[PDB]
Design an enzyme around this catalytic site. Structure first.
Site, PDB file in Angstrom:
ATOM      1  N   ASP A 175      51.879  45.533  47.591  1.00 51.64           N
ATOM      2  CA  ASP A 175      51.471  44.186  47.186  1.00 51.64           C
ATOM      3  C   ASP A 175      50.682  44.187  45.880  1.00 51.64           C
ATOM      4  O   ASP A 175      49.711  43.444  45.724  1.00 51.64           O
ATOM      5  CB  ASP A 175      50.662  43.513  48.300  1.00 51.64           C
ATOM      6  CG  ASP A 175      50.727  41.990  48.244  1.00 51.64           C
ATOM      7  OD1 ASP A 175      51.658  41.438  47.616  1.00 51.64           O
ATOM      8  OD2 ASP A 175      49.844  41.342  48.850  1.00 51.64           O
ATOM      9  N   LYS A 229      49.723  43.215  42.335  1.00 49.96           N
ATOM     10  CA  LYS A 229      49.831  42.031  41.485  1.00 49.96           C
ATOM     11  C   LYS A 229      48.432  41.745  40.942  1.00 49.96           C
ATOM     12  O   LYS A 229      47.452  42.254  41.486  1.00 49.96           O
ATOM     13  CB  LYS A 229      50.374  40.839  42.283  1.00 49.96           C
ATOM     14  CG  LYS A 229      49.613  40.536  43.562  1.00 49.96           C
ATOM     15  CD  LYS A 229      50.269  39.399  44.333  1.00 49.96           C
ATOM     16  CE  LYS A 229      49.527  39.111  45.635  1.00 49.96           C
ATOM     17  NZ  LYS A 229      50.067  37.897  46.316  1.00 49.96           N
ATOM     18  N   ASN A 258      45.492  40.964  43.167  1.00 55.38           N
ATOM     19  CA  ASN A 258      45.020  42.074  43.992  1.00 55.38           C
ATOM     20  C   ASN A 258      44.371  43.177  43.160  1.00 55.38           C
ATOM     21  O   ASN A 258      44.228  44.317  43.612  1.00 55.38           O
ATOM     22  CB  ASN A 258      46.144  42.618  44.879  1.00 55.38           C
ATOM     23  CG  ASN A 258      46.423  41.724  46.063  1.00 55.38           C
ATOM     24  OD1 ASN A 258      45.589  40.900  46.436  1.00 55.38           O
ATOM     25  ND2 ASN A 258      47.596  41.878  46.664  1.00 55.38           N
ATOM     26  N   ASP A 311      43.272  44.601  48.741  1.00 57.62           N
ATOM     27  CA  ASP A 311      44.265  44.066  49.682  1.00 57.62           C
ATOM     28  C   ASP A 311      45.300  45.075  50.173  1.00 57.62           C
ATOM     29  O   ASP A 311      46.425  45.122  49.673  1.00 57.62           O
ATOM     30  CB  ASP A 311      44.969  42.828  49.114  1.00 57.62           C
ATOM     31  CG  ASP A 311      45.676  42.014  50.186  1.00 57.62           C
ATOM     32  OD1 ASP A 311      45.847  42.509  51.319  1.00 57.62           O
ATOM     33  OD2 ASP A 311      46.069  40.869  49.889  1.00 57.62           O
ATOM     34  N   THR A 331      54.891  39.222  47.358  1.00 56.87           N
ATOM     35  CA  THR A 331      55.023  38.061  46.489  1.00 56.87           C
ATOM     36  C   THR A 331      56.272  38.200  45.618  1.00 56.87           C
ATOM     37  O   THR A 331      56.402  39.175  44.878  1.00 56.87           O
ATOM     38  CB  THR A 331      53.764  37.922  45.612  1.00 56.87           C
ATOM     39  OG1 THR A 331      52.606  37.872  46.455  1.00 56.87           O
ATOM     40  CG2 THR A 331      53.822  36.671  44.760  1.00 56.87           C
TER      41      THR A 331
HETATM   42  O1  LIG Z   1      40.441  36.271  47.979  1.00 55.61           O
HETATM   43  C1  LIG Z   1      40.287  37.455  48.287  1.00 55.61           C
HETATM   44  C2  LIG Z   1      39.231  38.197  47.783  1.00 55.61           C
HETATM   45  O2  LIG Z   1      38.375  37.571  46.932  1.00 55.61           O
HETATM   46  C3  LIG Z   1      39.042  39.542  48.115  1.00 55.61           C
HETATM   47  C4  LIG Z   1      38.003  40.396  47.732  1.00 55.61           C
HETATM   48  C5  LIG Z   1      37.071  40.132  46.730  1.00 55.61           C
HETATM   49  C6  LIG Z   1      36.059  41.054  46.456  1.00 55.61           C
HETATM   50  C7  LIG Z   1      35.966  42.235  47.185  1.00 55.61           C
HETATM   51  O3  LIG Z   1      34.983  43.145  46.925  1.00 55.61           O
HETATM   52  C8  LIG Z   1      36.889  42.490  48.188  1.00 55.61           C
HETATM   53  C9  LIG Z   1      37.896  41.579  48.457  1.00 55.61           C
HETATM   54  O4  LIG Z   1      39.924  40.113  48.994  1.00 55.61           O
HETATM   55  C10 LIG Z   1      40.946  39.407  49.554  1.00 55.61           C
HETATM   56  C11 LIG Z   1      41.791  40.014  50.475  1.00 55.61           C
HETATM   57  C12 LIG Z   1      42.824  39.292  51.060  1.00 55.61           C
HETATM   58  O5  LIG Z   1      43.640  39.894  51.969  1.00 55.61           O
HETATM   59  C13 LIG Z   1      43.022  37.960  50.715  1.00 55.61           C
HETATM   60  C14 LIG Z   1      42.174  37.364  49.790  1.00 55.61           C
HETATM   61  O6  LIG Z   1      42.308  36.067  49.414  1.00 55.61           O
HETATM   62  C15 LIG Z   1      41.136  38.075  49.193  1.00 55.61           C
END
Ligand SMILES: O=c1c(O)c(-c2ccc(O)cc2)oc2cc(O)cc(O)c12
Length: 275
Positions: free
Chosen positions: A137, A139, A142, A159, A178
């Site tokens: 995943d 992208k 992520n 993610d 995606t």
């Molecule tokens: O929106 C997301 C997000 O901000 C973050 C994230 C931000 C900062 C971190 O330190 C760790 C994770 O992870 C995610 C994981 C998902 O599966 C889905 C999400 O929407 C997010």
């Protein structure tokens, strides 16, 4: 495998919500015993076996198992796992500079800025693939920045909800990310391996350099059709002053046959990347 079943609120205080997807909501949090800050990801559990709401325990356990393995500067790290009847709660490393996606939207990058992000992504993926972990995943949303108010932001891959250990060179699970970023083997429901990540890197690179998505159609099915047919080209309006070596890099990644596609080791030795 079971996780800590004490109330997470007894050990952490939550704050700013960082974002949410279909099954997860991520909130900033602070551990009471150390004052250290983390990101708490609340993952909704399935309430019945035949449900399609929430995440199956098998999928949650696979994600946690993979996360526990990883310690690398360009990949998110896992601190703790809690659970209750409703959610599994992953206590994750806090990466507070926001998505690469939003960073790109505020600003087109130079080739230097592009390669500075890309090299970190490559190092992170090199680590994962060395451990036979396919992310599945990859992208811009992520990819998280540690601090976006610096000339050369450091990044971490996040993610791992679709991530799989590839023990036999390929996997044959569900797996579909995606549409703009999935490899043709995903589109065609074929066995998948580490190669799929390399295609996604090619798409990311194209976007980094141009600000445009190479296979994006007007609908999800058009995009998937474009991917399977390898329907992309370098638009002169976007690429006329982009180096040919950068195009060569992308060209060797956006290859339908996974066997002919550049591996992560190839990508690090490519003349555009290699020191
Ligand atoms: O929106 C997301 C997000 O901000 C973050 C994230 C931000 C900062 C971190 O330190 C760790 C994770 O992870 C995610 C994981 C998902 O599966 C889905 C999400 O929407 C997010």
């Amino acid at each position: 495998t079971v996780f800590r079943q004490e109330n997470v609120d007894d050990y952490y205080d939550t704050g700013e919500e960082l974002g949410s997807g279909q099954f997860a909501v991520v909130k900033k949090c602070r551990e009471k015993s150390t004052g250290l800050q983390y990101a708490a990801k609340f993952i909704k559990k399935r309430r019945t076996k035949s449900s399609r709401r929430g995440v199956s325990r098998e999928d949650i356990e696979r994600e946690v198992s993979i996360l526990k393995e990883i310690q690398h500067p360009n990949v998110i790290t896992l601190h703790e796992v809690y659970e209750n009847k409703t959610d599994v709660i992953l206590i994750l490393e806090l990466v507070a500079g926001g998505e690469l996606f939003d960073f790109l939207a505020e600003k087109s990058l130079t080739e230097e800025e592009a390669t500075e992000f890309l090299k970190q992504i490559l190092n992170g993926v090199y680590y994962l693939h060395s451990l036979q972990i396919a992310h599945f995943d990859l992208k811009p949303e992520n990819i998280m920045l540690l601090d976006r108010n610096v000339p050369k932001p450091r990044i971490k891959i996040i993610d791992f909800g679709l991530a799989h250990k590839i023990d036999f060179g390929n996997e044959f699970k569900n797996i579909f990310g995606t549409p703009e970023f999935v490899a043709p083997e995903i589109v065609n429901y074929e066995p998948l391996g580490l190669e799929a990540d390399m295609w996604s890197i090619g798409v990311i690179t194209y976007i980094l350099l141009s600000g445009a998505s190479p296979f994006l159609g007007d609908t999800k099915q058009e995009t998937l059709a474009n991917v399977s047919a390898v329907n992309y080209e370098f638009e002169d309006e976007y690429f006329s002053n982009t180096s040919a070596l950068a195009k060569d890099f992308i060209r060797r990644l956006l290859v339908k046959d996974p066997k002919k596609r550049m591996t992560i080791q190839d990508s690090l030795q490519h003349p555009w990347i290699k020191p």
